[PDB]
Ligand binder design. Structure first.
Ligand SMILES: Nc1ncnc2c1ncn2[C@@H]1O[C@H](COP(=O)(O)OP(=O)(O)O)[C@@H](O)[C@H]1O
Ligand SMILES: Nc1ncnc2c1ncn2[C@@H]1O[C@H](COP(=O)(O)OP(=O)(O)O)[C@@H](O)[C@H]1O
Ligand SMILES: [Mg+2]
Ligand SMILES: [Mg+2]
Lengths: 232, 232
């Protein structure tokens, strides 16, 4: 059993594991910490909806099934040590890299690669760093191609629900066939979602910058997407 | 007349300018400052030697000629807002991006792109940031191809002189034909040079980290390269 900041990973056999979503939330390299009753449930359910949508569009994900509420069954993968960030609208750390205001609409998507490494606080890397880390150029290109395809599908789907997909973080791993498979989660923890009309955050930024009620914000996302009220 | 931290750029006509190398040295985003009599002369002379070597190998540079001691005549270019860093051996900021020790020999060269921007303290960017900045993918690829070719020529030439080319920073601009031209300088200010036998720094790191006599170090480079003693 691996216990992370947001989730628990419980081995089943050699082929699969249980991904359990906790109520814990962290920010700022994990220096800001809180708990939000029902957060795990919402993130689990939204991950499921997103993975299923993406699977219908021919994206290979680790999603296998549900294991009752806060737990997903997922394929075990040899993980790439990357966080792959896709950005449509300027926000967060991008403001420190390009002299563009928050809300600036990008002419095309930006993909950023981050090296998952706590010693180094997850630095941004490029393709040459990735190669030194054992990730070939073809693997990187395949990964960015998938991320960009995921972007189009999620942003289209969300725009039709009055939600702007500002940016989001993905993780990937390799399966036993050597195929690149989308992993981890897709939730208001790992994406920026803005209301189309008011431009307000319906995501982890509410917690990051004390913008109000996180659970309310995560509920509103769930309701706008499912059309139903959360049961917890 | 543009006065920078290390050099002066003096317009001649519309086609060319004077690049004058000053004795000033800065480090740590320009927060550490000193002057070293003769530094401008050494950097000017070594730039000339490097530009001429590179021109012989068919690298297009801005070098036109000499204008007496500390001044080079150079082609005026529409500069890319980039610093292009090529790395052969782990040193400097690379230690904070990859968990590798100083002196680690890289399996192949790393190219890093930095956005020249004082507001943002020159952040690292990738190809997607560059595109948003108006630099096309083909331009970036051409730039990295040149940097990597420059790397091979300088490292070979220096190894035959008992000097390890650890890493170095280049800058580029476009000429009136739309060609990508190597610009700025190539000196112990803009490269890491290590003695092959002892691994000691013969470059700006001497000043950066108070490792001894900078002018001596820059002189030793000049002598190992030219085979003559500096005249100043
Ligand atoms: N299909 C998968 N196979 C193996 N590991 C995975 C898979 N999906 C996600 N992971 C990893 O499981 C962990 C999930 O826990 P989490 O709390 O989100 O991360 P962290 O512990 O880094 O904060 C992460 O290390 C993530 O990279
Ligand atoms: N051929 C060229 N044409 C136009 N500008 C150049 C050329 N070569 C170098 N430059 C620019 O001239 C300036 C040289 O001064 P320097 O002191 O080294 O830079 P800075 O002022 O940024 O510290 C830099 O801004 C550099 O980008
Ligand atoms: Mg995580
Ligand atoms: Mg400069």
């Amino acid at each position: 059993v691996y216990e992370g900041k947001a989730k628990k990973m419980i081995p089943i056999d050699d082929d699969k594991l249980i991904m359990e979503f906790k109520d814990d939330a962290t920010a700022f390299d994990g220096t800001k910490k809180a708990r939000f009753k029902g957060k795990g449930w919402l993130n689990a359910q939204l991950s499921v909806i997103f993975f299923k949508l993406l699977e219908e569009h021919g994206i290979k994900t680790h999603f296998i099934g549900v294991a009752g509420g806060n737990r997903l069954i997922v394929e075990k993968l040899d993980m790439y040590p990357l966080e792959v960030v896709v950005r449509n609208v300027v926000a967060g750390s991008l403001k420190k890299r390009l002299p563009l205001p928050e809300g600036y609409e990008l002419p095309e998507p930006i993909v950023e690669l981050y090296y998952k490494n706590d010693e180094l606080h997850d630095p941004m890397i490029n393709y040459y760093h990735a190669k030194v880390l054992g990730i070939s150029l073809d693997e990187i290109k395949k990964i960015e191609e998938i991320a960009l395809k995921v972007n189009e599908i999620l942003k289209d789907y969300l725009a039709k629900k009055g939600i702007i997909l500002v940016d989001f973080k993905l993780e990937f791993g390799k399966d036993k066939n050597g195929d690149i498979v989308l992993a981890d989660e897709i939730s208001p923890d790992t994406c920026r979602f803005w209301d189309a009309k008011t431009k307000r955050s319906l995501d982890k930024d509410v917690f990051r910058f004390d913008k109000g009620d996180l659970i309310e914000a995560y509920k509103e996302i769930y309701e706008r997407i499912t059309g139903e009220k959360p049961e917890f």
